[PDB]
Amino acid sequence: PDHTFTIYYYNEDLSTDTDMGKVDLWMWNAGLDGSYVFDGTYYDAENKVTWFKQTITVAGSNVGKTVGLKARYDNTKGWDGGSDTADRSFTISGDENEVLYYVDGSDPVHEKPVIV
């Protein structure tokens, strides 16, 4: 059976009010391909910041595989709209409520980071 995880993304230079629908993830490997668009938000009451959110479904047999990805800032301009500063990656843990925290500028991680 399929596995769904949530991935949060933060970029201080972007806004979850105006840029919603234009910010996505370009992803590859583990069955993933192409664009994956954020369509929700998560308010981080601890850091008092707001994240982009989306859920992503992979095949069950892809749990444990490494995903390559990078954020893109304005997909109405393709790559020319800008992307993250480098290739990122993480491993699909297959946890019950798997959540990835992707701060622009680093690999996404399973534990919630500190933002100021």
Geometric angle at alpha carbon 115, from 88 and 55, rounded to 5°? 50
Distance of alpha carbon 21 from alpha carbon 91, whole angstroms: 26
Say how many C-beta atoms besides its own lie within 10 A of residue 49's C-beta. 14
Let me know if 25 is exposed, middle or buried by CB neighbors in 10 A (0-12, 13-18, 19+): buried
Say how many C-beta atoms besides its own lie within 10 A of residue 55's C-beta. 13
The two three-digit tokens of residue 68, written as one number? 């390559």
Resolution of the model in angstroms: 2.2
Distance of alpha carbon 32 from alpha carbon 28, whole angstroms: 5
Distance of alpha carbon 57 from alpha carbon 63, whole angstroms: 11
Structure solved using which method?
A: X-ray
